[PDB]
Amino acid sequence: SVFIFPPKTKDVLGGGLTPKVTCVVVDISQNDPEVRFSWFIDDVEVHTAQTHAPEKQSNSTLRSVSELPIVERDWLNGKTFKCKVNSGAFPAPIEKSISKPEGTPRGPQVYTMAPPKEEMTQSQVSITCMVKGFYPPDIYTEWKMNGQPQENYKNTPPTMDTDGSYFLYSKLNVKKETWQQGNTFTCSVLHEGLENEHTEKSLSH
Amino acid sequence: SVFIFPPKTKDVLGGGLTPKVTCVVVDISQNDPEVRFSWFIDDVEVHTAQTHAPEKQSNSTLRSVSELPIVERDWLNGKTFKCKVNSGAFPAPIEKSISKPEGTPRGPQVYTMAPPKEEMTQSQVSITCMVKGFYPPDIYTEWKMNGQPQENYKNTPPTMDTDGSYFLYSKLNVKKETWQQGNTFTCSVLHEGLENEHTEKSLSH
Ligand SMILES: *[C@@H]1O[C@H](CO[C@H]2O[C@@H](C)[C@@H](O)[C@@H](O)[C@@H]2O)[C@@H](O[C@@H]2O[C@H](CO)[C@@H](O[C@@H]3O[C@H](CO[C@H]4O[C@H](CO)[C@@H](O)[C@H](O)[C@@H]4O[C@@H]4O[C@H](CO)[C@@H](O)[C@H](O)[C@H]4NC(C)=O)[C@@H](O)[C@H](O[C@H]4O[C@H](CO)[C@@H](O)[C@H](O)[C@@H]4O[C@@H]4O[C@H](CO)[C@@H](O)[C@H](O)[C@H]4NC(C)=O)[C@@H]3O)[C@H](O)[C@H]2NC(C)=O)[C@H](O)[C@H]1NC(C)=O
Ligand SMILES: *[C@@H]1O[C@H](CO[C@H]2O[C@@H](C)[C@@H](O)[C@@H](O)[C@@H]2O)[C@@H](O[C@@H]2O[C@H](CO)[C@@H](O[C@@H]3O[C@H](CO[C@H]4O[C@H](CO)[C@@H](O)[C@H](O)[C@@H]4O[C@@H]4O[C@H](CO)[C@@H](O)[C@H](O)[C@H]4NC(C)=O)[C@@H](O)[C@H](O[C@H]4O[C@H](CO)[C@@H](O)[C@H](O)[C@@H]4O[C@@H]4O[C@H](CO)[C@@H](O)[C@H](O)[C@H]4NC(C)=O)[C@@H]3O)[C@H](O)[C@H]2NC(C)=O)[C@H](O)[C@H]1NC(C)=O
């Protein structure tokens, strides 16, 4: 079984690293783990891919990962990425393709919320960011304080809403002090449906 | 092929019906659907299980479901439930086991938050419930209004936090009116780590 995955929104929209199409091969005969990857962009093979050694899983099977570094434009422009894997011990080569979705986009609304009053009794408080009404569910969310990106926050997976769109919450955990000191906290969101692909929302005490 | 499933959190934490470990058998030869189930609790067979007749699926294969009614304590206490199924037309008996995920419990803290000020311009608003610091990630969350459970809300999957515990948000969607009218909204949570396995938190305009 071969699974292919799209690039990360953060990466595709310059918000970070180099974008990559990832191809994962599971259920590999512990006997013949000599799997080979062949990547194509609209059926033209490329050799810039980087394949990783296989790893053992609980079920004594193996797993191999290959990453094709790509250009943000090729993806946004709808080109098809094809990863062809011939097990060498398999009857026939296995293929999987992928490209930017095609379904109708909807940018989300972004709201930031202060720590609930009751939590103020704690030594650590939560700064919440609500991101709702978006589609597709490919998105990127991070927290900043005084312009500096933060490490202590987590995003919930995009969740399906009653109206068909997705929503999610991002929680930044900070010491009570830090919130009271009045630093500026900014919720940053990257989505194709936003004007200029992103929106920032700030708040302070 | 066989699959085993844990009891429902609602049921395990008294919030409802009788808890049950479910064992599902798929890909059954339409020829020999005389499948037999054998249940064990720490390798001691029991006969309180209830097996259902097999059903046909699109792929002309069959599926059988067996349900072992259990006691809330046996599960919370970490006992192992084992379901052994010998197809009778299969080479060997197939087994699958299960037990409460692992380790030391931690009840969560529950906070409710009003709709963000900016959202008040909308015709529909969000009442938020933050549930953080819990483990294991087996939990149950629902919303009520004036004591009546509500349909229009959604829970995000439990998310892994930086400290090792899980957190999640539950969003109740209501018409602006409903929030302004001053009805009481209650966030109800069931977790083994809470005193009496649950906590409720209310709020209003
Ligand atoms: C032996 O062990 C192997 C590994 O052991 C571990 O497995 C994991 C899963 C867990 O059980 C551990 O306890 C084990 O130790 C087993 O390998 C697994 O095999 C299963 C197959 O049953 C694979 O499942 C597939 O998963 C993809 C999604 O993959 C992402 O999400 C996974 C869940 O969290 C995650 O584990 C993966 O790593 C992966 O994560 C992403 O990874 C990329 C890069 O790698 C990152 O960039 C992402 O950020 C990251 N995401 C994040 C964040 O987590 C899933 O899509 C597959 O489902 C599709 O196909 C099914 C076909 O069977 C179908 O039934 C589904 O409905 C679904 O179909 C799609 O549906 C959508 C809409 O719903 C349509 O739009 C699509 O068109 C449609 N596509 C089609 C045509 O299918 C599938 O469930 C699992 O990924 C793999 N583990 C990994 C990881 O490699 C092995 O199975 C086991 N063998 C035995 C003996 O059983
Ligand atoms: C012929 O048709 C059969 C039925 O037809 C229909 O099938 C469905 C699936 C759909 O395709 C329809 O269009 C078809 O008409 C096929 O039967 C199916 O066979 C597949 C096997 O490939 C079964 O898949 C397993 O699913 C479980 C999860 O089951 C729950 O969720 C399903 C998805 O929604 C749902 O369909 C099930 O009903 C079930 O729901 C739950 O049910 C219980 C009680 O029954 C309720 O209490 C719950 O509330 C309810 N949940 C809710 C809500 O939906 C999945 O866990 C299995 O994956 C594990 O094992 C894989 C091994 O192959 C492995 O690859 C996975 O990674 C995964 O492994 C686990 O991973 C986790 C972490 O990720 C680890 O922590 C675990 O340790 C690890 N466990 C291990 C060791 O594996 C698996 O995908 C499917 O359930 C079954 N359909 C039903 C239903 O019976 C049949 O396959 C087909 N045959 C042919 C010819 O292909």
Side-chain angles (χ1 to χ4, degrees):
Chain A
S1 308
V2 186
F3 299 111
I4 191 168
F5 301 91
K8 258 62 178 57
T9 302
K10 186 186 186 173
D11 304 316
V12 177
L13 303 175
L17 312 173
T18 298
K20 297 171 174 188
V21 179
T22 296
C23 230
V24 185
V25 178
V26 299
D27 293 305
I28 290 182
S29 71
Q30 195 174 304
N31 290 300
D32 191 314
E34 201 177 70
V35 187
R36 295 291 175 167
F37 290 94
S38 294
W39 295 85
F40 307 76
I41 298 177
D42 288 332
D43 299 320
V44 182
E45 191 172 303
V46 288
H47 310 289
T48 57
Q50 307 178 65
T51 310
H52 310 163
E55 303 177 56
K56 274 187 178 179
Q57 308 294 298
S58 63
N59 51 34
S60 304
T61 70
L62 304 185
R63 177 173 174 282
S64 285
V65 180
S66 196
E67 299 178 302
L68 185 63
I70 66 177
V71 175
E72 307 97 69
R73 302 275 52 175
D74 297 320
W75 179 267
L76 293 182
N77 284 317
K79 296 187 176 181
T80 301
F81 297 81
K82 189 185 191 182
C83 126
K84 184 181 184 181
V85 50
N86 191 31
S87 312
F90 228 70
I94 299 182
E95 300 189 313
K96 277 304 181 62
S97 289
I98 196 169
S99 56
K100 174 190 173 300
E102 280 187 4
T104 308
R106 201 190 321 184
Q109 281 141 286
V110 188
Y111 300 117
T112 66
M113 296 175 269
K117 183 188 175 185
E118 261 57 54
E119 182 178 44
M120 288 303 275
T121 55
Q122 305 298 291
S123 60
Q124 290 198 297
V125 292
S126 314
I127 303 187
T128 297
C129 188
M130 180 173 84
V131 186
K132 59 165 295 190
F134 62 98
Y135 189 87
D138 304 314
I139 191 159
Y140 179 72
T141 306
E142 69 177 346
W143 275 99
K144 293 179 193 149
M145 183 182 88
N146 301 317
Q148 298 298 292
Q150 301 297 285
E151 286 297 68
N152 206 177
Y153 77 84
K154 290 288 187 171
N155 297 322
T156 73
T159 296
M160 178 69 268
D161 216 333
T162 46
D163 73 344
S165 68
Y166 291 82
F167 73 93
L168 64 63
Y169 288 78
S170 173
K171 179 171 66 73
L172 171 65
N173 194 63
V174 307
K175 285 171 192 168
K176 165 97 141 299
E177 307 82 281
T178 306
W179 163 256
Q180 307 178 292
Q181 281 167 30
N183 301 74
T184 295
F185 301 89
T186 299
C187 179
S188 207
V189 181
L190 304 188
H191 186 84
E192 73 189 82
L194 302 167
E195 299 183 57
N196 290 78
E197 291 76 60
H198 50 239
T199 174
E200 301 201 309
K201 290 293 192 298
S202 296
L203 88 179
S204 63
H205 180 42
Chain B
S1 191
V2 191
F3 298 111
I4 191 169
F5 301 92
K8 259 61 178 58
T9 302
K10 187 185 183 176
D11 304 316
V12 178
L13 302 176
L17 311 173
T18 297
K20 298 170 174 190
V21 177
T22 295
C23 228
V24 185
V25 178
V26 299
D27 293 305
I28 290 181
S29 71
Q30 195 173 304
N31 290 299
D32 191 314
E34 201 177 70
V35 187
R36 295 291 174 168
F37 290 94
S38 294
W39 295 86
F40 307 77
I41 297 176
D42 288 333
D43 299 322
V44 181
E45 191 172 304
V46 289
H47 310 288
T48 58
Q50 307 178 65
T51 310
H52 309 164
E55 302 177 58
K56 274 187 178 179
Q57 308 294 297
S58 62
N59 51 34
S60 304
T61 70
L62 305 185
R63 177 172 175 283
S64 286
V65 180
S66 198
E67 298 178 302
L68 185 62
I70 67 176
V71 174
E72 307 96 69
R73 303 273 52 174
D74 297 321
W75 179 268
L76 292 182
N77 284 317
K79 296 186 176 183
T80 300
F81 297 81
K82 190 184 191 183
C83 129
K84 185 181 184 181
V85 50
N86 191 31
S87 311
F90 228 70
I94 299 182
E95 300 189 313
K96 277 304 180 62
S97 290
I98 196 170
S99 55
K100 174 191 173 300
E102 261 191 7
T104 305
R106 201 190 321 184
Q109 281 140 286
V110 189
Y111 299 117
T112 66
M113 295 175 272
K117 183 188 175 186
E118 261 57 51
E119 183 180 43
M120 289 302 277
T121 55
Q122 305 298 292
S123 60
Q124 289 198 297
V125 293
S126 315
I127 304 186
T128 298
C129 185
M130 178 174 88
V131 186
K132 58 167 293 189
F134 62 97
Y135 189 87
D138 303 317
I139 190 159
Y140 180 73
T141 307
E142 68 178 347
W143 275 98
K144 292 179 194 148
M145 181 182 83
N146 301 318
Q148 299 297 290
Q150 301 297 285
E151 285 298 68
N152 206 177
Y153 78 83
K154 289 287 187 174
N155 297 322
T156 73
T159 298
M160 180 64 262
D161 216 331
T162 46
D163 72 342
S165 69
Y166 292 82
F167 74 93
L168 63 64
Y169 288 79
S170 173
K171 179 171 66 74
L172 171 65
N173 195 62
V174 307
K175 285 171 192 167
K176 165 98 140 298
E177 306 85 280
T178 307
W179 163 257
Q180 306 177 291
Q181 281 168 30
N183 301 75
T184 294
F185 302 89
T186 299
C187 180
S188 204
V189 178
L190 305 190
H191 186 84
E192 71 189 84
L194 303 165
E195 300 182 57
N196 290 78
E197 291 75 59
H198 50 241
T199 174
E200 301 200 308
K201 290 294 192 297
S202 294
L203 87 166
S204 66
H205 179 49

